[PDB]
Amino acid sequence: LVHVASVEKGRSYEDFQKVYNAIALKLREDDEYDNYIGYGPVLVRLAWHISGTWDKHDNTGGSYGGTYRFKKEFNDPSNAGLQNGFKFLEPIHKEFPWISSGDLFSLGGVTAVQEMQGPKIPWRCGRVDTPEDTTPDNGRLPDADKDAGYVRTFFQRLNMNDREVVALMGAHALGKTHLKNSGYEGPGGAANNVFTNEFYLNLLNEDWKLEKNDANNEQWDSKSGYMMLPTDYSLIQDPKYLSIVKEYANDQDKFFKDFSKAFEKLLEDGITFPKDAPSPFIFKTLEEQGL
Ligand code: HEM
């Protein structure tokens, strides 16, 4: 399967910076969502789940085709709760009907991270919508109730290595688990709509307790009111993972730099970019624009 990036006709940096600003302006406006967390965390989760279907072996799945717009992927049990990120973006797609679905879902994730004061993420245009029959089947996204060997093995399919996996998981400092979506409940920290390295700090400094929640699932709970998933706590159980966790709890700039590279790579897996294709765009935030 080859998927070649095709820039939307005649579009350039300024067009996509207009779509960025539209998403970012609505993130500021619709602030009440999920008890004032706002839409940013569900939008970086949506960009991860449309990319996380990729399989390196046959180049199926991935962010290129925008296939989450089809019922099979929209109704995947693993995507429960992401309909709220879709409905947030649907106004903006009506306003810029020329951007492809893959591009709009991935730029929403980029915009949310930078607007929640994360690192800049280089983003590239050119994903092309593909037919309903290209939609990957349910079951390619990871279970939460498993251990470190499962996480390592699952992420080899998206060929991410240990460092990349640990840098990507730092995004679980954002938002929260919702019992009616996943059977898990609670936030992982106090700053859950500002991008920081707090996931790593909480993992190493809190007093975790294995408890059973109302959906009868086990999760790691702390006195402070935070929770960690079994696959999250996995990172301090494995010796290779645990020493990268310590590296990111001791250096927030290295965390930001490595997250930026692994999230771009995540979003680009499966796509062939021609050598005459434009460079990756670095978008300015509303704040850097005085907007
Ligand atoms: C083995 C890996 C992973 C598993 C099992 C997993 C699982 C989960 C689960 C069960 C939730 C709760 C969903 C809900 O109830 O609403 C969640 C939320 C979230 N995850 Fe993951 N995740 C994984 C990796 C990642 C990665 C790599 C990213 C992003 C780079 C990510 C970003 C998020 C975000 C931002 C949320 C919060 C959503 C919200 O607030 O609504 N996840 N994760």
UniProtKB/Swiss-Prot annotation:
The keyword Oxidoreductase applies. It is found in: Mitochondrion matrix; Mitochondrion intermembrane space. This is Cytochrome c peroxidase, mitochondrial. GO terms for molecular function: cytochrome-c peroxidase activity; heme binding; metal ion binding; peroxidase activity. Forms a one-to-one complex with cytochrome c. Keywords: Heme, Hydrogen peroxide, Iron, Metal-binding, Mitochondrion, Organic radical, Oxidoreductase, Peroxidase, Phosphoprotein, Transit peptide. Destroys radicals which are normally produced within the cells and which are toxic to biological systems. Heme b binds at H172. CCP1 precursor is processed by the rhomboid protease PCP1, which cleaves the N-terminal hydrophobic transit peptide. The m-AAA protease (composed of YTA12/RCA1 and YTA10/AFG3) is required for CCP1 maturation: m-AAA protease promotes membrane dislocation of the CCP1 transmembrane segment within the transit peptide to ensure the correct positioning of CCP1 within the membrane bilayer, allowing intramembrane cleavage by PCP1. It is an enzyme of class 1 (oxidoreductase). It comes from the Eukaryota. Its EC number is 1.11.1.5. The keyword Transit peptide applies. The active site is at H49, G188. GO terms for cellular component: mitochondrial intermembrane space; mitochondrial matrix; mitochondrion. The chain holds residues 71 to 361 of 361 of the full protein. GO terms for biological process: cellular response to oxidative stress; hydrogen peroxide catabolic process; response to reactive oxygen species. Present with 6730 molecules/cell in log phase SD medium. The modification Phosphotyrosine is found at Y150. Binds 1 heme b (iron(II)-protoporphyrin IX) group per subunit.
